[PDB]
Amino acid sequence: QLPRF
Amino acid sequence: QLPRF
Amino acid sequence: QLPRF
Amino acid sequence: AKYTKEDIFRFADEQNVKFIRLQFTDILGIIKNVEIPVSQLKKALDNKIMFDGSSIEGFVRIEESDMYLFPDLDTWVVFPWTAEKGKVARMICDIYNPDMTPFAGDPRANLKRVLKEMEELGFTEFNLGPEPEFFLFKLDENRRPTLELNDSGGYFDLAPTDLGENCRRDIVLELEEMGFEIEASHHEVAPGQHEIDFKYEDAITACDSIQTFKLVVKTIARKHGLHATFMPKPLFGVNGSGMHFNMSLFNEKGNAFFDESGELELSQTAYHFLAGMLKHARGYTAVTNPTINSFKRLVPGYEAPCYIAWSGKNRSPLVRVPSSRGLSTRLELRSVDPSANPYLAMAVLLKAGLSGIKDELTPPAPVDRNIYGMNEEEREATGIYDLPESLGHALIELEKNEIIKDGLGEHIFEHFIEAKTIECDMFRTAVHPWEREQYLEIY
Amino acid sequence: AKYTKEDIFRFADEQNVKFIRLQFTDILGIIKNVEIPVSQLKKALDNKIMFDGSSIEGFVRIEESDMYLFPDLDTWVVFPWTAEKGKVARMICDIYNPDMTPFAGDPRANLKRVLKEMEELGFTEFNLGPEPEFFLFKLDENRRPTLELNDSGGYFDLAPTDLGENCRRDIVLELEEMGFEIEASHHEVAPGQHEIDFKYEDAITACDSIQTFKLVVKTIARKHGLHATFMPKPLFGVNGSGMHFNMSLFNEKGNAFFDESGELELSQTAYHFLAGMLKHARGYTAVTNPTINSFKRLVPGYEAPCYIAWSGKNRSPLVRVPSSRGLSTRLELRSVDPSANPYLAMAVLLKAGLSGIKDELTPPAPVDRNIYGMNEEEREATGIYDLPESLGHALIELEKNEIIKDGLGEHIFEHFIEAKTIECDMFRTAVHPWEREQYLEIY
Ligand SMILES: NC(=O)CC[C@H](N)C(=O)O
Numbered sequence A, B, C: 001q002l003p004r005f
Numbered sequence D, E: 001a002k003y004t005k006e007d008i009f010r011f012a013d014e015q016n017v018k019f020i021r022l023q024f025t026d027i028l029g030i031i032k033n034v035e036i037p038v039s040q041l042k043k044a045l046d047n048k049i050m051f052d053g054s055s056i057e058g059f060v061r062i063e064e065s066d067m068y069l070f071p072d073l074d075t076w077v078v079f080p081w082t083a084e085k086g087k088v089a090r091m092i093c094d095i096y097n098p099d100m101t102p103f104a105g106d107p108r109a110n111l112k113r114v115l116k117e118m119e120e121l122g123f124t125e126f127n128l129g130p131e132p133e134f135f136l137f138k139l140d141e142n143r144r145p146t147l148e149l150n151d152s153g154g155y156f157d158l159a160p161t162d163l164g165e166n167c168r169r170d171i172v173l174e175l176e177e178m179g180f181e182i183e184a185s186h187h188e189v190a191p192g193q194h195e196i197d198f199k200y201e202d203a204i205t206a207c208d209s210i211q212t213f214k215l216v217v218k219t220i221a222r223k224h225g226l227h228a229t230f231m232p233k234p235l236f237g238v239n240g241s242g243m244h245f246n247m248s249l250f251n252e253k254g255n256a257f258f259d260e261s262g263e264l265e266l267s268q269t270a271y272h273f274l275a276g277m278l279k280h281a282r283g284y285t286a287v288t289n290p291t292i293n294s295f296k297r298l299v300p301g302y303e304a305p306c307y308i309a310w311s312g313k314n315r316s317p318l319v320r321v322p323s324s325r326g327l328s329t330r331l332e333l334r335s336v337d338p339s340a341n342p343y344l345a346m347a348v349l350l351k352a353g354l355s356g357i358k359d360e361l362t363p364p365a366p367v368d369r370n371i372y373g374m375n376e377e378e379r380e381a382t383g384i385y386d387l388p389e390s391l392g393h394a395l396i397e398l399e400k401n402e403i404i405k406d407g408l409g410e411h412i413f414e415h416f417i418e419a420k421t422i423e424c425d426m427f428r429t430a431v432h433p434w435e436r437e438q439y440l441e442i443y
C-alpha cells in the first residue's frame, strides 16, 4: 500500500 | 531589493 | 538569451 | 516611568559603559541596531539620532530614508559579558519620521497604535505570556552548527542532571541575573529541546523580553560551544518548536475574561475574543508562521495545531483555555512559532480579538471528540477547517482578509507580502536533494 | 503481422537464446518483467503464463491478483550484451484478465482502447515522434552517480569530438545495430545534456521504442562508467530535459492535419485538435508531468513552457506547429518530460484531441508578442493562462476534469491519484537542507 514512506 | 535572490 | 552571464 | 534621563546618565557613569546599542526590530523579525559611544548618549536621549529607516523593510529596501531613533528609557539593560574595556548597554528605540511622527512601517509603532485602539474601546492592558522552545546543537571544529543534539532527553525529564554542562541552568541563571522574570524551565518532548517560561507582562514589554531572550540564549549557547536555534522544525520526524501565547485582556475592574456567573467561568468578552480569533485564524496564520519551515511543523501527530478549533482539553487544539481562573484567566494560541515577529503577531491577534468583540460574534462549540479520528470530509461538514498547508496559501489568505491588513498597516502589509512572495518563489524553483534521491536513479 | 510463432521459434533456435524477459510497464512508468527460460517459450507463446497483476499498480498495491501475459510477437528484440552463456531476448506483453479480457489497469491496453475509439471516429493511425533529452554524469569510485557532468558542451556544439569517449556516438551506433530508426543526435543547451531523435511510428510502437531507448541508454552509459538520467531538472539554474511529442493524425486519404487551401496550410481537423489540446492542458498537465521535480523544470527562462498558448514561432510555447507540411504536418507538445509514462500521456492527449474534434471547438488566436513581456495580470485578460505550479494543483485539476478521467479509465485514475498524493505528502512533510541553511542561524 505505501512502502515509499 | 533582491539580495536574497 | 544570455546564458553567458 | 521607571527611569528618567538623569537615572540613565547616573547608570552610565557608575557602571562605566562606553558603548550603547540602540536596537530595534525589522519586518522580518531580525534584531538590528546602531552602535554609539557613551559620549553621544546625551544626544541619543535628545531623540536627535538619524539613521536609515529603509533597513526596517529588510532586504526588499529600495530607497534610503532618514528616520529618528527615539529610545525607550525603561528598556535600559547592561550586558554582563563585556570584559573590562567598557561595558555595553542597550535600549529598544522607536522609529519616528523627520516630521516628528512615528513611522508606520515600524512593528513596535504598529503595536502601539493597535493598543491605542484597544484602549479606545475601553480596555486597559493586554497581558501576554509566551512559551518559547529552542533546540541545542553541538558545534563542529570550525565552530559551525552540526545536526547532533546536546542530549537525548525527554518530556520533563531530569536529563541534563548535575555535575557540569546543563546549559539550561546556566541560561536561566544569567537571565535571572540580567533582570528577567522567569517562572519555570524544563525539557521538552524532543531530545535537545528546552522550554523556558516567562512572567506575564504588557504586550510591548513581553515582545521586548522575547527579543532579548532570543539574543541572550544564542549568546550563552555560543559561550558553551553550542548552537541555540529557534527554527520551528529543524529535524524531520521529531517534535517542533512552538511559542504558545497566553493572552489576557484587562479593564479598570480587573480581568475582562473572568466571570464567575458565566459558562466555564468565562465572560462574554472572552467568548467574543474566541470567536474573533477563530474567524480570522486562516487570515493571520501567515503572520504567526512567516517561514516555509514553519508549515513543516503544522503537521498531524506532533501536538502542533492543524485545525481551526478550540477546546479546554484536547490533543493539539488551535486555541486552548487553561483551567486557571480569576486574575489568571487567559486564552492560549498554540499556532505561533518562535520564528514569528512578536510585534506583528500581537498586533494581528489583538486586531482579530477586537473585531470579534465589536461584532459580538458567537464562537463555535468546543470540540473534544478527537477530530483527528475522522477524515477531512467527515469534519468539514462541521465548523472544523484546515489551516493553510503552505506559505503561499497563507499569503493568499492574507491578501484576501481585510481586518488583518488594517491591523498591519499598508506599509508593513506591502513589504511583508513582497518579502514572503520572494521567499516562496526562491523555495519553489530550488532543486532539493530529496528530488535527486527519489528520481535520479529511478528515471 | 511482422513475425509469427514459427519465426520466433526459429530465431530462438538460431541465435541460441536461453532467457526471455516478458516485460511490461506499470502505472508509474517503471519497466517491469518476468524472466523465463527458453524451454518455457512455447508456453509463453500460448498466452498461458500467470503472474501478479497488482505489480502494475506499483507500490500502492494491496491484494494479489492473477493475470495472463499475452506477449507481442512484433516486439522480439535480442540484446547484444549477453556474453556467450545464452543470449537474452524480450517481448512487450499485454495484460489480460483470467476471463480472457484485457486488463483495464494496463497502460498499454488503455492506449489500445483509446486508439480503438479514434479508429471508430474515422481515423487510421496516430503517428508520434518523441524528442527525449538526457543528462550524463560521472560515476564515483563506488560506481555511484555524482553531480559532475561528462562534458561542458553547448547547443549543437561539437563538444565530445573524436578520439575516444563520445558516449552519444556509441549509444546511437548500438541503437542502430539493435534495429532502431534514429533520425539525428546532437548536444543540448545544458552541459552534459544530449538529445537523440526518432523516426515517426505508431503510438504503441513509439511508446515501446521510448521504453527500450531508456533501458538501452542507461545500460550503455553504465558500460562506459557513466550515469544516464532522464530527470526533468537534475540541476538548478540549468536547462531541463524535455520529451517534446510531435503528433500527426492520419486517415485513409493521408495526413488529416494538412490542407493546402486552409489557413497556415492546416485543416479544420488540426484546428479542432489544437482547441482540444489547449482546452484540457490544465487537466492532463499532471499526467504529462507526474514527478515533483517535473514542475521545477516548468519555470520561465529555460525554454520550458509555462503558459497555455500555441504559436508557430515563439519563445517556449505550449504547442508549436513546425513549418514542415504535406505528409509531415504535425503538432508539437513541449510540456512532456522524459519521466512521464508514454502510454498514459498518449492516451490523455489523444482523448483531448478527439474531444476537441468531436466538439468542433475553435482554437484561440496564436500569440507571437512575447507573452513573457507582460505580467500575469496583463496576460490573464486574454486567453493566456498559467500551467499548474505544483503537482498538488495538477492533481486537483485532474480530479476536476472528466474527459481525462474517461481517457485514463477508473482503475488507472484511482491508482495514479493515490500514488501521486502520497508523493506530494511525503515531499510536503520533509525538511530539506535549504530550510536548514535559510532559517538555522537566522532563527
Ligand atoms: N508538550 C507540548 O505541548 C509540546 C508541543 C510542541 N513542542 C509544539 O511546539 O507545539
Ligand SMILES: NC(=O)CC[C@H](N)C(=O)O
Pocket (backbone or CB within 6 Å): E133, E188, E189, E239, E240, E241, E242, E243, E302, E303, E304, E305, E334
Ligand atoms: N533548445 C531547446 O528547445 C531545449 C528545450 C529544453 N531542453 C526543454 O527541456 O524544454
Ligand SMILES: [Mg+2]
Pocket (backbone or CB within 6 Å): D131, D133, D188, D195
Ligand atoms: Mg511546551
Ligand SMILES: [Mg+2]
Pocket (backbone or CB within 6 Å): D131, D244, D332
Ligand atoms: Mg502551551
Ligand SMILES: [Mg+2]
Pocket (backbone or CB within 6 Å): E131, E133, E188, E195
Ligand atoms: Mg531539444
Ligand SMILES: [Mg+2]
Pocket (backbone or CB within 6 Å): E131, E244, E332
Ligand atoms: Mg522540439
